[model samples]
Target: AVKKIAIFGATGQTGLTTLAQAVQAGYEVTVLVRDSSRLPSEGPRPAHVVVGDVLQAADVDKTVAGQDAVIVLLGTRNDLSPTTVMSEGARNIVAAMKAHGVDKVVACTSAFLLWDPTKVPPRLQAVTDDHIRMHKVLRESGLKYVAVMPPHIGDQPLTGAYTVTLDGRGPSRVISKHDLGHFMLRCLTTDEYDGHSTYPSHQYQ
Candidate 1:
């Protein structure tokens, strides 16, 4: 059977790279987007596009139904304004997943959560707090999930070399978005890291 997957945040830089990879890999892909126009005008378009907000159950359900797995790349696009968008999206995604009996999900957060709460920079603290909530939602969901927490995601091209650790402590301070996408997609096939947050970084040269 062809593997079917739903991708949230498929229009962002990392999400766009992941979307292209998934399309090239030939997975039946569905994406939930607020504006389909945000997707690339060319190359490896999603097999299906659900035009809606991830926070909406109806939209999320439509995107998740009949899918084999999900990859959540939700973010606030670096907006430091206090918000629950990511966590809210996670709750909605997990709810729909349970309703549809889809057990596998690879969600992206931030590696900064590994830092001491008091030490997290004030500007990043808001998003980090939401990431913590997002992690809590996924852990409590009881589904097979991997929360991929990567340090600064660089716009550089893929290096195809990165190190992954269960603990977020590492000197590897950045990961190319391409490599991040590669690892998240791999998690779909390898469930060994299921039910844990994974921290991946570009191996320092």
Candidate 2:
């Protein structure tokens, strides 16, 4: 299990949910976010919070310094650029972690959302393409990494039951971000998913 962990998108909603669980489980947590002041002070906050851009190599290295594992929960906003944040962010993250000798990562990607192109909405193509590149970067990082590729994330409650598929296959079409966050927590310590592209969440109730 990862006793010390760092998160890339600590201020995002999805990542925020996961961070809470990590601390509750007694794991030392660190968060790298753009706005350090936005971090919650009432609840179980992180032990460390570095304010900087993920695209900055120095920032990534500083956030993850001496951490046991890194969690990637970044998302491409509606901004004009999608090419750099996801792809370049992963590049910087992997480089920093490897340079610092941290070998474990639990990252999430949306490439699975592109599997059924004809069925996907056209508006999401750009972001999906960006996530594809990010996934590729994580895959080639040569570290113990697990990328959770989910088709859709909803605001539903956690359902511990979910199927994971490797070899470019998917078991579920929709999964709750809350549930996915829990799974990311598991990947921090479990080797059963190492070196595999995991597609979690099914459409079943």
CA-lDDT, candidates in order: 0.89, 0.81
Query: Top lDDT: which candidate number?
Result: 1
For candidate 1, list the clashing residue pairs, or say none: none
Clashes of each: 0, 2
TM-scores for the candidates: 0.95, 0.90
Question: Residue 150 lDDT in model 1?
Answer: 90
Candidate 2 similarity to native, TM-score: 0.90
Deviation in Å, model 1, residue 189 alpha carbon: 1.0
Q: Write the per-residue lDDT of candidate 2 for residues 1-205, one digit (tens) a residue.
A: 4688998887777887898888888989998888877788788898888888998889888988899998999887655354658889999999998889999999888744437777655676677778878888988888998878876788878777776677476756787877888889978767998988887775655
Tell me the tens digit of each residue's lDDT in model 1 across 103-169: 9999998887778888889987888899999999998999998988899888777776788888556
In order, what is each prediction's RMSD in angstroms? Answer: 1.4, 2.1
